Design a protein around this nucleic acid. Structure first.
Lengths: 144, 124, 171, 51, 216
RNA sequence: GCCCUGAAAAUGGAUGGCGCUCAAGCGUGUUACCUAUACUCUACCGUCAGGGUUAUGCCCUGACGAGUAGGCAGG
RNA sequence: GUAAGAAGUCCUUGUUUGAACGUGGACGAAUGAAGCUUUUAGUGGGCCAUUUUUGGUAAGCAGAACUGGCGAUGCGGGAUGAACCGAACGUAGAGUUAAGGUGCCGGAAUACACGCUCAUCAGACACCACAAAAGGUGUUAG
């Protein structure tokens, strides 16, 4: 016998893969597994961890929250990033000309961004633009 | 005991609670006896003391006021401060070590002599 | 096991106020140095106020017999705290060495009294130089002039199971 | 893939501890000691033998 | 490039051999000087006491069932998790109290250089983050404990036996030794008495070398 | 210290049985020996962890494996 | 109970004869190896053992306080046995052992050594645990 101390055969949790069955999302995690493994940048590991999350833990993030983030000092021209979904907001009337990348945009939010002048981009295009996450600003939605 | 009144207690100092029977006023705290707490504020008549009291399995924080007659200066940190100052001196001397503490080590080799002390043999 | 005699000395640890304390010595019969030192401290705790942490041993040594082929008549004092207050015993053993005398003594006590190593205390083993100081009759039996005696029953150890001889025990 | 043991297999012994070669040359375990004749004390032999 | 690799290897190897020769000289002159000190005291009629042992080797003797909680925890602390597993420990008051607590369940003593060398050579396994890696090469030690200047298995043996500044780190790098039961046997019929009472446990102070050489 | 007695019934009966008397009994000591799913070494199965790699996969390394009520997963 | 340091030590002067805050400069016993929610099964006054302690009498014992184990647990030994000794389990092989044992049943010395003992149903773990307090011209050593 050994007189164990650590409750052998632990599983460690941590969601090594997503529960989803979306093949495109699986392409995305297949790409970011390569990137986070070979780059050494921490941004890619963050994004890969976020891709496994559920709908409950991927809340939507608003245009107004993005504009708040861009009102920060020395953070106007950064490429903002929401792994989840991006919603419109009719409470704000003035919107910047920023670049933003996300899985899913709504029609109204995409229209607002395009109207202000910027562009709406996917995560793979964000990868071929900025692999290490250089000049990026990640955002997250209110959980509760 | 008049020396229990010419005793400055500044915020930060650590003191034990030991309430004497000779003063009926402010006899505190049945089990706050031989328990140590630092002082947070002081008024006349008065000193503040805080103690970490455990309930369940968490230490909550109880602040209190006591008469000066019951409290007493703690000699808890005497060797701590002495060792800190000696460590500063030894670090200066090094800059010019094992300043850390160490338990009792095994005593080393030596020689015992027989000049007038011949060994005395005996039995039960 | 086969015992040995060990000289042991103890120093009880110096202090300020008292450098070089008095170096008490003892003779022990025991298998090895560990048991010898335990017995040393066991007797020293009884005699004086010392402790294995409060004292130290100076020089463990062995004592070999000066003449381990010369036959000798030993007299042994023994005592054992049983059942009453302690009471003593004098025995005589004809042997070559103090080690053999002590070994056969321990065996004889275990046989004849059911008294054990833990129970027994050795006071003094002493060779008797002169005849006529030998008191016990079973040792007096063997000091007579031109002693002879037979061994009338011989029984021979047999290596085999079967024998074809109707064996004989003669001499 | 397989643990090979020193104290056998002089090759893996010599992979480590290359002092072993000259150790075995000078032999350094059957090594003789410088002789001396420091006799002991009368008090020592006395207190050993008795009293 | 391969020549550069071989050059670095040759440099480190020469360093190892001079270090090991130095250690051999140290050990022999130390023991010889202790012997001559004993002889000098004897000639002058004085007595010489050797330094109290500072290292001990400990071996587990009892299984896991019906062990009380305090010795169970102390054995966990000393990494004696199973029967016949063993470790070196540095002896001070703090450790002597532990040994007093776990005396019924362990046999310990003062080890020799020969048995330390045999253990570290035959059953020497190391920890590289984890995992009980076999040593098998001086590079595995020069990686991890080259921080402390221990470039070789013999340097590690030296830091062990001569108890050094980094004995703690070297001993924790050393996985607990996994030993078998002795080939000649335990001697005594019944184990669970003291070494003095015809048992096996407790301190025996020199015969642990014999025991671990039978068990390894 | 050992031995005898030192009271206990009723189917035939048990130091486990045979039987043992300088013992095959009592006490003690020295060795050798038998022997477990225990310890050591190796292989294989599975789980867990750590690494590597254009693929809920492939490779390397190591530690572990009791189980009722009951829970989870793969089939 | 508290303490065993970088949320700590030591220089720098504005606000009640001085305290607190603030400005900036120099620097520690041993051994061993995360936290946060969320949610629901089964069990929620059962049995055994040790040692602490109160009360106890024909004898036993009754109450509380830890701890360990069985319950859920197979393996070797005790001739057999839920809670005694050892030791905890993947499938196999080789070696070494534990506890217990080596006249035959039965694998292993009718081994070695020192003594004692003869029982008209000896003994073959004891327990000033019961018969119990002694008796005996049986024996041995003091």
């Amino acid at each position: 016998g050994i007189d164990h101390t650590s409750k052998q055969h632990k599983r460690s949790g941590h969601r090594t893969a997503p529960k989803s069955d979306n093949v495109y999302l699986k392409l995305l995690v297949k790409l970011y597994t390569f990137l986070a493994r070979r780059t050494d940048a921490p941004f890619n590991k963050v994004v890969l961890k976020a891709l496994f999350l559920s709908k409950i833990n991927r809340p939507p993030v608003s245009v107004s929250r993005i504009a708040r983030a861009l009102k920060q000092e020395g953070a106007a021209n950064k490429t903002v990033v929401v792994v989840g979904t991006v919603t419109d907001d009719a409470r704000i009337f003035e919107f910047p000309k920023t670049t933003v990348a996300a899985l899913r945009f709504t029609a109204g939010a995409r229209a607002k961004i395009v109207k202000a002048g910027g562009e709406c981009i996917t995560l793979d295009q964000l990868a071929v633009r900025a692999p290490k996450g250089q000049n990026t600003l990640i955002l997250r939605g209110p959980r509760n | 005991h008049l020396s229990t009144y010419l005793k400055v207690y500044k915020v930060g100092d650590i003191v034990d609670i030991k309430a004497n029977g000779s003063i009926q006023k402010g006899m505190p705290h049945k089990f706050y006896q031989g328990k140590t707490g630092v002082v947070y504020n002081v008024t006349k008549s008065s000193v503040g003391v805080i103690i970490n009291k455990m309930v369940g399995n968490r230490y909550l924080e109880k602040r209190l006021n006591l008469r000066v007659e019951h409290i007493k200066h703690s000699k808890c940190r005497q060797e701590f401060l002495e060792r800190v100052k000696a460590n500063a001196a030894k670090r200066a001397e090094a800059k010019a070590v094992q300043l850390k503490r160490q338990p009792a080590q095994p005593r080393e080799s030596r020689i015992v002599s027989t000049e007038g002390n011949v060994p005395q043999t005996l039995a039960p | 096991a086969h015992f040995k005699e060990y000289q042991v000395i103890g120093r009880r640890l110096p202090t300020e106020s008292v450098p070089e304390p008095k170096l008490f010595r003892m003779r022990i019969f025991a298998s090895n140095e560990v048991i010898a030192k335990s017995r040393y401290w066991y007797f020293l705790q009884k005699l004086h106020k010392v402790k294995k942490a409060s004292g130290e041993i100076v020089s463990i040594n062995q004592i070999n017999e000066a003449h381990p082929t010369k036959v000798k008549n030993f007299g042994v004092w023994v005592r054992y705290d049983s059942r009453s207050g302690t009471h003593n015993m004098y025995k005589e053993i004809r042997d070559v060495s103090r080690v053999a005398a002590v070994e056969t003594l321990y065996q004889d006590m275990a046989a004849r009294h059911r008294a054990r190593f833990r129970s027994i205390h050795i006071l003094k083993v002493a060779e008797i130089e002169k005849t006529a100081d030998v008191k016990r009759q079973y040792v007096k039996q063997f000091l007579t002039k031109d002693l002879k005696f037979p061994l009338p029953h011989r029984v021979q150890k047999s290596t085999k199971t079967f024998s074809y001889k109707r064996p004989s025990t003669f001499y | 893939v397989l643990k090979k043991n020193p104290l056998k297999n002089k090759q893996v012994l010599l992979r480590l501890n290359p002092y072993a070669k000259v150790f075995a040359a000078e032999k350094l375990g059957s090594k003789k000691a410088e002789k001396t004749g420091t006799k002991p004390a009368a008090v020592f032999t006395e207190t050993l033998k008795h009293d | 490039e391969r020549a550069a690799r071989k050059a670095a290897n040759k440099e480190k190897r020469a360093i190892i051999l001079e270090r090991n020769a130095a250690y051999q000289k140290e050990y022999e002159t130390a023991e010889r000087n202790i012997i001559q000190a004993k002889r000098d005291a004897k000639a002058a009629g004085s007595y010489y006491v050797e330094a109290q042992h500072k290292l001990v080797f400990v071996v587990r003797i009892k299984g896991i069932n019906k062990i009380p909680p305090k010795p169970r925890k102390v054995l966990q602390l000393l990494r004696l998790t199973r029967i016949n597993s063993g470790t070196f420990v540095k002896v001070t008051k703090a450790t002597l109290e532990l040994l007093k607590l776990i005396e019924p369940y362990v046999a310990y003593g003062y080890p020799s250089y020969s048995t330390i060398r045999q253990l570290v050579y035959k059953r020497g396994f190391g920890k590289i983050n984890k995992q009980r890696v076999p040593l098998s090469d001086n590079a595995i030690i020069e990686a991890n404990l080259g921080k402390y200047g221990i470039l070789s298995i013999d340097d590690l043996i030296h830091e062990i036996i001569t108890v050094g500044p980094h004995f703690k780190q070297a001993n924790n790098f050393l996985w607990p030794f996994k030993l078998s039961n002795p080939s000649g046997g335990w001697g005594v019929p019944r184990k669970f008495k003291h070494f003095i009472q015809g048992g096996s446990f407790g301190n025996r102070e020199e015969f642990i070398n014999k025991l671990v050489k039978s068990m390894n």
